Amino acid sequence: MLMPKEDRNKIHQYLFQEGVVVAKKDFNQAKHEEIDTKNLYVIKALQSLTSKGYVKTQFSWQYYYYTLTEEGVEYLREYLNLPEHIVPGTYIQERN
Amino acid sequence: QQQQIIKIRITLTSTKVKQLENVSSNIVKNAEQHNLVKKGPVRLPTKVLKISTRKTPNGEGSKTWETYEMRIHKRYIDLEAPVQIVKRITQITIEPGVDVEVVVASN
Amino acid sequence: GRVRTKTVKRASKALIERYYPKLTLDFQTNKRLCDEIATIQSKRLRNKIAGYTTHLMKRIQKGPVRG
Amino acid sequence: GDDKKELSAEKEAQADAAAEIAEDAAEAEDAAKKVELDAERIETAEKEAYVPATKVK
Amino acid sequence: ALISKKRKLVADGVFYAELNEFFTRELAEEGYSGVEVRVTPTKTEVIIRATRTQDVLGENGRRINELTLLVQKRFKYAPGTIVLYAERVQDRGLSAVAQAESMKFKLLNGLAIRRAAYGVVRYVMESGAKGCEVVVSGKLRAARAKAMKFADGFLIHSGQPVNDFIDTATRHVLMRQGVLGIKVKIMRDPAKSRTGPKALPDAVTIIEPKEEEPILAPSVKDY
RNA sequence: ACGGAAGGGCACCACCAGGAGUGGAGCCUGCGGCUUAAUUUGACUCAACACGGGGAAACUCACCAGGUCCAGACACAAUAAGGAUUGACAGAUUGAGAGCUCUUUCUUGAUUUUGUGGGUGGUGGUGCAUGGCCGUUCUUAGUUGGUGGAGUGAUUUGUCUGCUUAAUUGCGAUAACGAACGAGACCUUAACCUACUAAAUAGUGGUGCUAGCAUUUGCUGGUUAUCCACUUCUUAGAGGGACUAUCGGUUUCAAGCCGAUGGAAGUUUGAGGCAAUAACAGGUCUGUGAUGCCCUUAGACGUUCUGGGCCGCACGCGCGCUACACUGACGGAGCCAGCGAGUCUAACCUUGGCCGAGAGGUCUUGGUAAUCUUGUGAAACUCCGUCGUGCUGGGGAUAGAGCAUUGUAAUUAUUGCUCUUCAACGAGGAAUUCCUAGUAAGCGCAAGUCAUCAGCUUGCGUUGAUUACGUCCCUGCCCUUUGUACACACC
Ligand SMILES: [Mg+2]
Ligand SMILES: [Mg+2]
Ligand SMILES: [Mg+2]
Ligand SMILES: [Mg+2]
Ligand SMILES: [Mg+2]
Ligand SMILES: [Mg+2]
Ligand SMILES: [Mg+2]
Ligand SMILES: [Mg+2]
Ligand SMILES: [Mg+2]
Ligand SMILES: [Mg+2]
Ligand SMILES: [Mg+2]
Ligand SMILES: [Mg+2]
Ligand SMILES: [Mg+2]
Ligand SMILES: [Mg+2]
Ligand SMILES: [Mg+2]
Ligand SMILES: [Mg+2]
Ligand SMILES: [Mg+2]
Ligand SMILES: [Mg+2]
Ligand SMILES: [Mg+2]
Ligand SMILES: [Mg+2]
Ligand SMILES: [Mg+2]
Ligand SMILES: [Mg+2]
Ligand SMILES: [Mg+2]
Ligand SMILES: [Mg+2]
Ligand SMILES: [Mg+2]
Ligand SMILES: [Mg+2]
Ligand SMILES: [Mg+2]
Ligand SMILES: [Mg+2]
Ligand SMILES: [Mg+2]
Ligand SMILES: [Mg+2]
Ligand SMILES: [Mg+2]
Ligand SMILES: [Mg+2]
Ligand SMILES: [Mg+2]
């Protein structure tokens, strides 16, 4: 899957922020909600990061569910030179 | 220095006909206990949502059909309450499964 | 063609077996007896149960019968 | 399986359920990151990170 | 709002199905046994019913944070519009789904078909249920698909008591050479119903009489 | 388990007695066959053939003729910052304003490529590898365990000659006694409430306000609240009600049955729903991101795009629709239902005012709905006429010419209207279907489908019979007995 590094950094950083991402199984969408790239660019970008063991996937009615793993966290943590314990999508907001 | 008149219509819709009916009358005089006049439980005709479909996934065997049913119940109540009980019977008014809807004056 | 089930027949004999002081030869009286003397689950069920006991008790005042 | 070794299977299943409820009854009496993500950029928003110039010739 | 309520009621009915399916799928390793959401124009409240909750929440609630954050974006609920809490299921061995998944993970670990099946049946019985039954269909090392039934106790199959006291759950366990079908049937104790009738209509219990003294020729006292 | 043996049954998917019919003809539709570049495919007694919800213009779509793309994850290696790879203006080319390919030469910068390994998808195969579902035995009545009797034992008795039942439903007989699944119970729906709870989103009476004719005060309406009362109608909550009741007839005067009265109701109250054990190489890999294995995978069986096909037509079969008329067609006019549906990021159901022969157009409004569309003023049907027994005005195939609507696209004519053309068909051989009470049959309506398309289906009400109220003759299936060398069980 070929894509400009800029469109890949958008989704790549979005995962570190929220820790999880969803996407409908519908190519020809031409743009993702909550993201500024084509839905197609996202799905097999994730499934690529999935084949590496960095994220777990599921389908459940044609919507993709991705959860970042305890091992992939470090992978992207060095993609923008994030610091140790910069942020997981694991911080209780106030008292949850 | 509050509690003006309301002109309220509380129309409740749900599928559970014993859980919506217990909270239906749970408020039938949870207002009359506080002596508010009212036009009580109004029962619109129950709604029958039918689904007729062949049982086989394929088109083999005897042409056996199967009708499914879903029944809906929506009850509206016109009240005579104050401007601070607006949110009193709003939270323990519920039972999982009953859609609550409160309305405003006739215009 | 309605032969009563032996569920009701088994019940009718088991009550006439211990309630002849009570259990008058009338259905309505016997019907309101079961709601208080039995733990039946439905009107229709107890209706044939009581309606049967009546026929049995109506015949005992004629002679004896099995059960 | 087969009906010849069933007994050793039935009692092993009996002994099986024994362990499942043993844990069930046993689980009745049993016993950060001072950085941010959405605000790490709002914090690391410092200047001296780019140099723009264009429109030559 | 903005729609008809018959469409609304069927709409959230579909919603419950989509949810329950997604839950049985993502976290099945925790004995998930169904969910339900509460109607409240306060928040939206779905309660997970698994058998190992601490695993559902994760490190200081890290993973439920993940799980909650996911269902949020499917229906794009504004952050805060919904949150879910994990509630362990009381005596899991009465609700079929729990035991159905139990065998799935038992056969998947190499247990003998008869041994694993018989285990859950004796467990479900000593767990309270009035009756139980489990059927295993498909092929197990034999090209021809067989089917064995395992049942204990009492089990009604006709009429309405079925919908009241029997909990069924099927599960396709995908093994090395095929797809095995697992079906579970648990008969809840009717007397212990706690909501609704507490005996099948068949039950007709008569309260027996007592002391019948002799005539004891008339006497009467005053007060 | 089976038999091409014997005895008993049950049933309009069996007859009896009848009804309305198919089969005959025209069209509609499916199946075969044939034809074709393709005419995609499943299925072939009941249990394939208006079935795959299968009413295909693109899609659907699986087929055929052609054109694109990788969405070939991940791993190693190779190429490679002198550039791995990306893209396009015009031009030739092309169905094509596809940089597919080419010419020219700018571009992009490590995201690809190449190789291998490994995957990925497919409506490719295998339903004779499976799940699951479903269809059939089954308009059925079967299964089982406790204590006891028999047997060395597998087993049997229980679980039965007869009688009754829709029912292994009971009576009765009884080495068996007493029970459970399944039948019953149960659940849902249609029928009964002037008794309970009351509702301008349901309706009634009075009264205002209001209009016509008659007068004598009346009769028939208008009135989104003018007020007042009520719950019979309407609605849906809670109860009650039937239990075959009473009496009688019949019978081991047992289960039961039958007649009469009463009764909302006395055919399991009518109709459903559910439904045990087993059985099938039944159908479904063309619903499934359910799946085992096999096939293919970059000139693709992936995928999309353009067009064609599934409709193709010497014929054979099947589910249908319209008729052959006078219990009619037509024209005025009378003019009554019920089950449903229905528009938010929207184009759904549509009243009403005009324009238009029509179809339709157009201008606004109600409605997320017991509130508006709608009393769905539906159709048969009732009434008053024209027609006159002659293919006639019955009939409406085929066909020409025009106007509309759906839609990116209507040619092989999507559908609607208009004029004209006016077939076969004069009651259907041998054969065979469905059915017993608000049923049959006639009648239209909603819903599914659906942009448009019902001659289909699923429900509904509308008008409303005949003849049964019986038998085992036909047919089918059960159950005994019985033979069996079959047990992979007569394939
Ligand atoms: Mg009591
Ligand atoms: Mg039943
Ligand atoms: Mg008979
Ligand atoms: Mg008969
Ligand atoms: Mg005949
Ligand atoms: Mg005939
Ligand atoms: Mg392309
Ligand atoms: Mg490769
Ligand atoms: Mg390879
Ligand atoms: Mg597939
Ligand atoms: Mg085949
Ligand atoms: Mg099969
Ligand atoms: Mg199968
Ligand atoms: Mg019959
Ligand atoms: Mg012995
Ligand atoms: Mg026998
Ligand atoms: Mg009333
Ligand atoms: Mg009478
Ligand atoms: Mg076959
Ligand atoms: Mg399948
Ligand atoms: Mg095409
Ligand atoms: Mg076809
Ligand atoms: Mg047919
Ligand atoms: Mg006429
Ligand atoms: Mg004109
Ligand atoms: Mg509006
Ligand atoms: Mg003529
Ligand atoms: Mg004509
Ligand atoms: Mg005829
Ligand atoms: Mg339609
Ligand atoms: Mg159809
Ligand atoms: Mg023999
Ligand atoms: Mg033979």
Structure in words:
The structure is cut from a larger assembly and holds chains A (96 residues), B (107 residues), C (67 residues), D (57 residues) and E (223 residues). Chain A is built from three helices and three strands, in the order αβαββα. By secondary structure, chain A is α+β, with helices and mostly antiparallel strands. Chain B is mostly beta strands and 107 residues long. Chain B has one domain: Ribosomal protein S10 (Alpha-Beta Plaits). Chain B contains one helix and six strands. In chain B, strands 1, 2, 3, 4, 5 and 6 form a six-stranded antiparallel β-sheet that branches. Chain B is elongated, with a radius of gyration of 20 Å. In chain C, α2 packs across α3 (43-60). Chain C has helices spanning 6-16, 27-37, 43-60. By secondary structure, chain C is an all-alpha fold. Chain E has 223 residues and is an alpha+beta fold. Chain E folds into two domains: 13-87, K homology (KH) domain (GMP Synthetase, Chain A, domain 3, 2-Layer Sandwich), CATH 3.30.300; 96-192, Ribosomal protein S3, C-terminal domain (Ribosomal protein S3 C-terminal domain). Chain E has six helices and seven strands; from the N terminus they run αββααβααββαββ. In chain E, the strands form two sheets. A four-stranded antiparallel β-sheet of chain E has the order 5-4-7-6. A three-stranded mixed β-sheet of chain E has the order 1-2-3. In chain E, α4 packs antiparallel against α5 (113-126). In chain E, 29% of the residues are buried. Chains in contact: A-D, A-E, B-E, C-E, D-E. The structure holds magnesium ion (33 copies). One magnesium ion is lined by residues 158-159 of chain E. Chain E binds one RNA strand of 491 nucleotides through residues 1-8, 137-139, 143-145, 149, 154-163, 170, 172-183, 200-202, 204. Chain B: Keywords: Acetylation, Cytoplasm, Isopeptide bond, Ribonucleoprotein, Ribosomal protein, Ubl conjugation. Chain B: Pfam families: Ribosomal_S10 (PF00338). Chain B: Belongs to the universal ribosomal protein uS10 family. Chain B: There is a cross-link at residues 7, 18, 87 (Glycyl lysine isopeptide (Lys-Gly) (interchain with G-Cter in ubiquitin)). Chain B: It is found in: Cytoplasm. Chain A: This is Small ribosomal subunit protein eS10A.
Write a short abstract of this structure.
The structure is cut from a larger assembly and holds chains A (96 residues), B (107 residues), C (67 residues), D (57 residues) and E (223 residues). By secondary structure, chain A is an alpha+beta fold. Chain A has helices at residues 5-18, 39-51, 72-77, and strands spanning 20-24, 55-58, 63-68.
